[model samples]
Target: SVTTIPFWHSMEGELGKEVDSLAQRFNAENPDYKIVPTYKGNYEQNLSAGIAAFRTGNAPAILQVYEVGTATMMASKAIKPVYDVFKEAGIQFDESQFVPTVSGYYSDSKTGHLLSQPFNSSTPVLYYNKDAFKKAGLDPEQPPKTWQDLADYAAKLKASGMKCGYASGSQGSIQLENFSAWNGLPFASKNNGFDGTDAVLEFNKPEQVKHIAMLEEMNKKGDFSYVGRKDESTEKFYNGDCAMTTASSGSLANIREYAKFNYGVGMMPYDADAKDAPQNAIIGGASLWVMQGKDKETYTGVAKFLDFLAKPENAAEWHQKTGYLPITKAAYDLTREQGFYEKNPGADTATRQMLNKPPLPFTKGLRLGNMPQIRVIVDEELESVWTGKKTPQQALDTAVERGNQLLRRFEKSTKS
Candidate 1:
């Protein structure tokens, strides 16, 4: 009898198609099992739905959860850790094979065991319209390397008749969180919340305040546009409405599929003044978590599928077809050996940015509980800044205050 494994995910559009195709391949190769993938909704919606389903005892065997949800998932006590699932199934698993930064994010701090399978990890990168650059009399090959340069290019792009000079997806991720780490500053205490549940946000520091203030200035000058709190700005880039965008490397597939004009990708711009700026960017995409309460046979099949997905050939194919970072070192090596990067300039931008330097303690990544909700609080405060209701300093200060309260609540809830 074929064991039909249900999988719930948030991948939509081109990304959703890829997930379906991967499942079909896995099913075809293993006739004894079938993988059925479903899209519940975006990350926030999917997490909510998955939790509700779990309470109803109808949750899928596998769930795709964003990186920010890692701490919450660990606190759920209703999921099987990836390491245990593979070990129990007698699958050959090697933690060393994965990229240090990527694997480190999902692994246990003390035991060093992986908690979730790193499936679609990615970092933010800059995307620019080559045509717009040329029209603005800027070098198409020279994308901005620093925030100052980006602002100047935005002015030129606007002067060249573009409706908006720049936009970004995931303001909380790109602007505040990663912005802090990239500048060698802390986003939260206790090693960006990786150390303990009592960690508090520190993103309202001077650097963060200055960065947001710069963006606010750009908005007033028409060099920047506030699209939305999440990936809402992506459409602006794909439709050529925004001349440049900072978004997840995973967004490359959609941008390639829909963008009609010539475009280029570059490393995310940094603050020129921060002496040690451009520390490695944290991962943004989601991972596959094996849910609890599955029968023995189903779990074995899920483990087999995960092993299949980890094959260097399979991993390389996924990385090339989509712009997500190759989670494993072997996959990255294979992709480079196959000349994929040679054929596609800037294809390795995300990987290179992640490896730019050894990640500092706080730069490793955030594992803050209630992060999704905190992200929303950040979004609300930032929106106020864009609308002229609050200064950058006030907005960030208020966001930190509100975010810390949620942290405290999470700490309290998890204590028992």
Candidate 2:
């Protein structure tokens, strides 16, 4: 009898294509197990479906969950941890062997252990249009390294008659979440929700306010362009509407394909003159989580499929073909050995940033419950700032107060 393992994921586009291909290859080689890659929806939608399915007793063997879903999943008490799943199947498993930042996000916050297998992980990086830079009479090879530099460059780009200087969609989730982690600052209290559900919003503080105020001023000067609510920020770059933008590292393939001129991938510019300057970027994409109440045989099949994915060659292929970061040092090494870096000049930026330094409490990632909803709250508040309805400080003040309400409710619900 063959076990059919259904895996749900949120990836689409180049990333979605690559993961589906991997699943097909795994199914062909492992005859006793058939791993089916199913696309439910975007990260939040897929997570919602996964939860609904779990309650209906029809959950897939594995569900790909975005980082925002972490706290909710953990609180459900409805699944086996990945480490135990691999161990019980008599397979090799070690969390430390994986990329620290990637593994650290999906790992036990205090114990330093992986809770699930990371899949198609990514972080925000600075992407620039080389042609746009040159058009503005700036060196194409020199992208901004600090926030001040980014501001100066944006001013120059706009003054050069460019339609836009910089743009990025998902200001709430992608930019702000990443901004928090990359600065080694907390997005929420209680160690960014690593400690417990009792956490409250803290990003309304000095660092975040400072960044938001700067962007607001840029907006007023016509240098900061607001792309629509999606990855349109990336589209703006591809279309040459903007000289520079920040986007998920996973967007690498899209930028590479749609760009008509030379482009460059670089680390996110930071407040270099600040006392604590910059830190490692946190993971953005989803991880492969084991759903609960599956049959023993099915779990074995899931493990088989997961082990195939864990192979260094396959991991490297996924990274090279798509923009997602390699999840393991071995995968990074395999890519390095094959001369992939030389072939693809900026391919290693995300990986180098991931393993830049040891993981710190702030850089690990946020584990707050109701994070999906909280992200929406942030979007609402920031929208006011961008629309000129509120000052950055006032907007953030409202964000903290309103955001804390959701956190409090989440904490209450979890307890009951």
Candidate 3:
């Protein structure tokens, strides 16, 4: 019997159940090859554990690596290139079939070699309370399109006696990364530290400082609430205490299940008049990377699983149920055909908004090593600004200075 082990990082309760169902189906169909999935910790822990396992020759055949770890994994020789593995397994690996923005992040920018199979990719979007908007005399169907509009809407919501106008998990590093992405600001130089051996943090630059200052003022005016971290703000948004939130599109599943009020979704708002106001938002979630040193049989099993996952019907079902963007055009088209959007309006808006135009250099995506740590730096600096311990400019400048040092270290370590 051929056995394949998979390490999953996120999507514990409901998402895990769905993954199990898919695994069971695969097992039933291919009795000779069985895929066993194990629940790992969060993104950072799972990735660290996987690396340790790889060193000890005990890593899973397939691992769920977060987007931020792409640069590290690509640099590590412990992972086999997906295209090579698929070809070795005699499977046709059509790289073009994937969403360019999603796949490009994990692929070699110079050669376009796929490093991993895109899975569970998601982008940040604005989730708003339709009921709150209506109560505030704002249009419920039409959400804010610009940063100014969002701030204005928040003010109106607060004026309407809402406890909080806007809530987001920017206190956490991950959410700060998303915030930086929506603002079209660079978290690091070299297009988010993706280019070469040198790294620099630019989040404290002029644009970023202005954006954070806006958020700080909003927070002071009761138009924005700084919820703790790691989805805590999401809870506030769901409970109807907060009228608007910027969170992962993947959170739609839980929000739909828990939110009692009418809700609306919109693109990440930006200053429409700013020269580079709204670049495309970066992705959250994880992908499947085949580990190196796995036997041929294991590689074959991994290839088969990826092929199954890429099928239009399966991909569409996964996207519709989990709120993750389908990585393939076929699945996207299939979702439209199934009227998944019409029946569930505002569901597909994230994907549509992201792909509205050709992704610019800044909008393509970010690639930074030690991003989880960098995110922590951002959180700390932003906290100081929010709490009046430091001015926005001062806090951001310090963060960028410190964060760039870490990036430089990471770039040095990852150098081939």
Compute each candidate's TM-score over C-alphas: 0.90, 0.94, 0.93
Spell out the clash pairs found in candidate 2. none
Q: Each prediction's Cα lDDT score?
A: 0.87, 0.83, 0.79
Count of backbone collisions within predicted model 1: 0
Tens-place lDDT digits, model 1, residues 322-343: 7789988899889999998877
Tens-place lDDT per residue, model 3, 307-389, is 88888888888898778988888889999998878877678877875665555554556787777787788788888877889
Residue-by-residue lDDT tens digits, candidate 2, 1-416: 77889889887776677878898899889888888888899887888898889999998889999877888889887678887787777767766668888888888876776788888788888888788788789999999988889989999988887788999686565578778777777888887888888888888878889988888988898888877568889999888888889888877778877888898988888776556657777887788889989887888888888778878988888888876899889999999999988877678888887876676686687888887788888888888888999998998888888878988988988885
Ten contiguous residues with the weakest lDDT in model 1:
168-177
- What is the model-wide C-alpha lDDT for candidate 2? 0.83
Best by lDDT: 1
Residue 358 lDDT in candidate 3: 54
Cα displacement (angstroms), candidate 2, residue 406, comes to 1.2
Superposition-based RMSD of candidate 3 using all C-alpha atoms, in angstroms: 2.2
- List the candidate numbers ranked by lDDT, top first: 1, 2, 3
